[PDB]
Amino acid sequence: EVRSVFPEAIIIRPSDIFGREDRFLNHFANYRWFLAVPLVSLGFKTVKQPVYVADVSKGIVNATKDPDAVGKTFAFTGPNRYLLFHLVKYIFGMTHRTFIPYPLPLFVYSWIGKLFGLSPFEPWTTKDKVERIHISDVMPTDLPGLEDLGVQPTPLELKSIEVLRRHRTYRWLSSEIEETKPAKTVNY
Amino acid sequence: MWFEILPGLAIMGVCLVIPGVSTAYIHKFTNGGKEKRVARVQYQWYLMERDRRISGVNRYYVSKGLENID
Amino acid sequence: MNNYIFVLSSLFLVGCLGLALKPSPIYGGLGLIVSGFVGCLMVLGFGGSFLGLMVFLIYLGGMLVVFGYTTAMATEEYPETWGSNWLILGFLVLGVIMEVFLICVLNYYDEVGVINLDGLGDWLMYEVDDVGVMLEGGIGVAAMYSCATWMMVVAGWSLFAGIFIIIEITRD
Amino acid sequence: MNLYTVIFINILLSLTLILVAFWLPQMNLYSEKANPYECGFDPTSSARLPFSMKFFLVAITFLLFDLEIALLLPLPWAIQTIKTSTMMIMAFILVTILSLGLAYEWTQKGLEWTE
Amino acid sequence: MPSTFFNLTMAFSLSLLGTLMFRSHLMSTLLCLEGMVLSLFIMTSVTSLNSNSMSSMPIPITILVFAACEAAVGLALLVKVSNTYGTDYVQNLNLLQC
Amino acid sequence: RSRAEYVVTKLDDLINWARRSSLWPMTFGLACCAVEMMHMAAPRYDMDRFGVVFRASPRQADVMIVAGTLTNKMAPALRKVYDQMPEPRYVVSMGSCANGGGYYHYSYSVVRGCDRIVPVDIYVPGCPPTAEALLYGILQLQRKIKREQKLKIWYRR
Amino acid sequence: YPSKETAHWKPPPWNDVDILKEKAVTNMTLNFGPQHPAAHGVLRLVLELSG
Amino acid sequence: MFFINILTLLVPILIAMAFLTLVERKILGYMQLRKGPNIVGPYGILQPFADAMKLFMKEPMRPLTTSMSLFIIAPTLSLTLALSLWVPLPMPHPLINLNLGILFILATSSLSVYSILWSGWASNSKYSLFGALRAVAQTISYEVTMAIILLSVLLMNGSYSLQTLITTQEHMWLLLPAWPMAMMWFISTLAETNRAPFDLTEGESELVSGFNVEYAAGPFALFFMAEYTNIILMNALTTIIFLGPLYYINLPELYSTNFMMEALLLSSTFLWIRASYPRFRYDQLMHLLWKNFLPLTLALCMWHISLPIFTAGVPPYM
């Protein structure tokens, strides 16, 4: 509809954005308030490449200023693709909290997401939220991206501790970057 | 002036006389026009249990006088 | 209202288990305060209130001084609680499971030995003077002033010599 | 039973108050919100470090004096004894010994704080 | 009473086990000693109340008095240990082997 | 309109009444403007009569009266004690220094207004503003947070 | 009778007073102010305290 | 009916606490040549409700370094122990009639000290640690002195119950026989309640806020309610023990009215003292309570051991 009305609209498609006030890293860190982490198929066969919020905002500003960005669709993705299991494992490792994964089928996971979503305030999760969690990220091949808009994609390993240090306890509060093993990346 | 304190003082006074007066009235109401019996010793507790058995309604405060004696 | 004393005894056992498991001495003093309160309740249920309130007050003062001391010198940067170590928490839940298993074993195998669940709540108060004044527990401790003056003087000399002893130890 | 009931009512009331205090207002917490307070600057060291106690001898003396209090507390039942002379002499001896211990510590500067 | 006394005996056994199995904190060892003391007091008090032995009721108070003197001396010794080493570590209190 | 909208508006009025009748400032000041602030605390104007009582810790504070020159060396501390205040918090800049630098606007070591560091709700002008003017700013802040419609916006979401 | 497990031992001192390494005094460092009622608003009193 | 009795004790005590906060504001203002709150409500009488609602609709703080379990446990413990200490007081009939009433009072007061200590340690901050250690020293001094004071007074009374204190003061106040230890008991109650000049734990000028410097909103409200309920509690205990209200068997309303008037006078005296005096130094408080009060308390304890013996006025057991 936006392309039909405004034909030269710059359409920016980012991946799951992570940041200080996000609902991605903070969401997976707030999974610690329950007993386990109910991932679908144990978090495998689900690939994600999250993108930093400052990278997305720099891309948007450079799209305001860029003469060659008009009428294009950009794909804003992070430099590394992770499986969902390894991503959640890295998140809980940075939190130093614990890690107990649990394979939960998608229909009952959507059921409990709906149960959380029937809330008058901001829900903790929804059926659409868990579906977007377990949808894999496509590989951007033909679309331009942050490099074509002049932004270097900062890695999650570099910008992770500014988000997840809040979710630690006092024992692990003063833990550095190098004390957490980075997650394994996948080329696909 | 200094008498503007008196509304809050009066509210405090009412809220301090309510618990004691209400406790006395509730004791009197629940013990049937008499004060709640104090059993500080086993003798007084035994008196209370004997009255409870004597009354025949399982209430110690229902006292029986000379109407039970021929 | 029958297993009330048994529930209190189990809580006392759990508090002593935590104290044995030895968290940071702040939590150790907390567990000892809870155990002292539970023991005060047990003495209250079994009889006179004076002994329970006395041990409660004594342990409140004692763990106050212990709290001051463990903030002074027996502290660490990351104080250790029951949940900070997997081994300590595992020993805690294993001790709870072992307590349940042992009371079930004594209920079934040993029949009426030390633990009887059917007989629980039947043998708490054995014999009481139904009619009688001067029966409370503080009167014996008062009789220490008259009947056991030797007990009074050895306790008083213990406190006096203890004052001299602590002054000489911390004289430095 | 009544005392247990009113203690439980107090427990329920305070738990309800703290529960509604934690679940009623809007939450917005971040790192600088929950960092510890040191008058506007970062804490130089953790507050779990050893913190010297200058009245430790007075605290030990407080332990001994509290047990002297525990000894003195059965006096309102002790004054009902037949042999009031023995009770009076023993109570006088106990209080005099306690006072002599306090006087000796005061003389030996145990009540004064270190440094 | 017998189940309660068995639980109190097991509480004393746990506190003695804690005393005999040291960790790094001498203060925690002293707390285990005080737990043993508390179990002894509760056992003596419930025995006296069960047997109506008002003549033996001064005995638990005497136990508390002497045990508090023990705890006082232990705190003074812990003060001396901390002045020597900076901590109350029983691993620091080890140089008397030779 | 709907019956529930009226109930939500009345609840908004109740919450705003509580928050404007209980405004506790942080015991925080920097200069001559803070001298006028304690002259507002003084018996003539009686912020305590208005319900306004100083609390030393920022955790118990509701409003922050930036009263004085915010320097570069002071700005991290001011931001820290602002961030440590709980969420229903407000900022009253007081005096020309806290407003826009004032007499030290072109100085190397002065933040040109505390609105570069913290979001300011109400600006009180003067050098110093009188305690009358600071009290006027406090009452204006009370009216401003009386105007808030949080539950109504939440219902209309 | 020295062995491998006791060859590292030293004889005790003649006066039973061992030379120990001088432990560093860990004094608490406090930021008295600037957000303090007694600090007059803009004083960062770094206080080195023993107790 | 017993639950209704619980309600009609608990709720009026809470409202009296809130209006004690209001009356402290008004009395301190009028002693400081100002007015205090008269805008929020007719004469300021809605100000405590405004403050309570604001605090319970402000978000609480959960600091990263803070032990969450004890941080939560301490304020609810403080409020529960305040109401528990309120429960056995006779006016002239207690809700819960105990034999060792003052021993219950002493145990519950020491447990409230533990609530303060655990709050100060759980809030992992240096000012909170200072507040906890100052609380330790303060409760050492007032605990030993107040215990000996209460022992001497009840030796004059004869038993640990408080209806017995009413019967003791049926004809005359205990202030006349025991006025020096009444003064020392009043100072001990000030130190117990942490009121100026012996507050020293919520040190406004020395520390920032002391033990509750990391507490915000709801738990801070719980601490404030516990403290002011303890103020009314200790003044009520003082007027029950020393200034015996007129008790008549046919009507207890006169006793309740006289008790209310004397308790209000003692609470107003607390506010008056806070206005009048500067704060002690916390080593000077210990030196005071251990060098001036304690020797005189031991001497007066020996005197009250001797006095019924040589006057044959040994009090009855019941």
Ligand SMILES: COC1=C(OC)C(=O)C(C/C=C(\C)CC/C=C(\C)CC/C=C(\C)CC/C=C(/C)CC/C=C(/C)CC/C=C(\C)CC/C=C(\C)CC/C=C(\C)CC/C=C(/C)CCC=C(C)C)=C(C)C1=O
């Ligand atoms: C010259 O150099 C300089 C200085 O050097 C001198 C400086 O200093 C300096 C810095 C300057 C400043 C920071 C300025 C600060 C100003 C001052 C220092 C002067 C002001 C004076 C004071 C602060 C002293 C105030 C004294 C008082 C006596 C006021 C009283 C204050 C109190 C805190 C105590 C009263 C308590 C409260 C207000 C809160 C009480 C209420 C509650 C918490 C409510 C609790 C109640 C409930 C929860 C009850 C609920 C239960 C129910 C049942 C209710 C039912 C409810 C229903 C809805 C039904 C600068 C910059 C400077 O240049």
Ligand SMILES: CCCCCCCCCCCCCCCCCC(=O)OC[C@H](COP(=O)([O-])OCC[N+](C)(C)C)OC(=O)CCCCCCCCCCCCCCCCC
């Ligand atoms: C509840 C009933 C009413 C109680 C009083 C309530 C109204 C008055 C309240 C006043 C405000 C108090 C605010 C806090 C004050 C804190 C300071 C303070 O009090 O310090 C204590 C001060 C301390 O004085 P000081 O500290 O200044 O003294 C210096 C002492 N050195 C040098 C060692 C440091 O006084 C006392 O300790 C005295 C306590 C009361 C003594 C009463 C003795 C009466 C007489 C006994 C009998 C005498 C005759 C014997 C027989 C002879 C036979 C021939």
Ligand SMILES: CCCCCCCCCCCCCCCCCC(=O)OC[C@H](COP(=O)(O)OCCN)OC(=O)CCCCCCCCCCCCCCCCC
């Ligand atoms: C947040 C956690 C808080 C944990 C701590 C709770 C503290 C509660 C308040 C302080 C209590 C201090 C200790 C009191 C012990 C009992 C005092 C006493 O003297 O009780 C005796 C009394 C009757 O005895 P007596 O006076 O001789 O009368 C006989 C003839 N009328 O009465 C009796 O015999 C009744 C015996 C029971 C009385 C105590 C009931 C306590 C109930 C449990 C509270 C904790 C529940 C667990 C935690 C819940 C979740 C947090």
Ligand code: SF4
């Ligand atoms: S605006 Fe003027 S009066 Fe206020 S702080 Fe600046 S120089 Fe001082």
